Amino acid sequence: TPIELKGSSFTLSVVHLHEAEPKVIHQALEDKIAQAPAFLKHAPVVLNVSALEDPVNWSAMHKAVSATGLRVIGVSGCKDAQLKAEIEKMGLPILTEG
Amino acid sequence: TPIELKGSSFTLSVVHLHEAEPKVIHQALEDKIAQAPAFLKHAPVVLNVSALEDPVNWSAMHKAVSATGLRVIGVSGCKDAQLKAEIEKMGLPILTEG
């Protein structure tokens, strides 16, 4: 009675990563935020990694994204075993699309 | 090309909180997680507070929920600017719920 568990859809902003170096991502997110500063400043985002080939230093990637003001709520599209196992270690949840 | 930002829909676990004491909520959550551990461990959750009432210690509730391993990524169905205000302090986003 105290809780109920449900499954519901939420639209979230997704950052689809295509290059891997944190600094390049930081610069690119900066430019993107400037396209709608009032909405994208401090926006909660999900990091999608489906299109990544090179390995990603996650702690460093998490800091580079966070430094732009964006707030990382988790990671999606992670279709690797180890890699998945990695992300979940720093308290970051894995999210899946509907 | 290094980045894309677009909205996507995500099917999420929503814990609907009802009238109660952080210890009780922590109790109820552990019992749910135990029934489906393979799926529920470190799951991302949204906390729906629409059924809560005037007095509620948000810091105590968030700590209790997080203690179960669940990863609170946002709050939904909020009903006052007070509680709301207390939520964005810790940087938790507010979500709208399908």
Residue numbers in the entry:
A (entry chain A), B (entry chain B): 4 to 101
The authors write:
Proper cell division at the mid-site of gram-negative bacteria reflects critical regulation by the min system (MinC, MinD and MinE) of the cytokinetic Z ring, which is a polymer composed of FtsZ subunits. MinC and MinD act together to inhibit aberrantly positioned Z-ring formation. MinC consists of two domains: an N-terminal domain (MinCNTD), which interacts with FtsZ and inhibits FtsZ polymerization, and a C-terminal domain (MinCCTD), which interacts with MinD and inhibits the bundling of FtsZ filaments. MinC is a critical regulator of FtsZ polymerization that is bound to MinD and oscillates from one polar region within the cell to the other.
We targeted E. coli MinC (EcoMinC) for a structural study and determined the crystal structure of the dimeric EcoMinCNTD at 2.3 Å resolution. We observed EcoMinCNTD as a dimer within the asymmetric unit. EcoMinCNTD forms a dimer via domain swapping between the first β strands in each subunit, as observed in the StyMinCNTD structure. Dimerization of TmaMinC is mediated solely by the MinCCTD domain; MinCNTD is not involved in dimerization in this species. By contrast, TmaMinC lacks the corresponding Gly and Ser residues and hydrophobic residues that stabilize the domain swapped β1–β1 interaction. To generate monomeric EcoMinCNTD, this antiparallel β1–β1 interaction should be broken and the hydrophobic residues will become exposed, because the long β1 strand cannot fold back to make the β-hairpin structure, as observed in the structure of TmaMinCNTD. Thus we see dimeric EcoMinCNTD in the result of size-exclusion chromatography, in a broad range of protein concentrations, as well as in the EcoMinCNTD crystal structure. By using unfused-EcoMinCNTD, we observed that EcoMinCNTD forms a stable dimer in solution and in the crystal, enabling us to conclude that EcoMinC dimerizes through both EcoMinCCTD and Eco­MinCNTD. Taken together, the results of our structural study of EcoMinCNTD reveal that domain swapped dimerization is a likely mode of interaction with polymeric FtsZ.
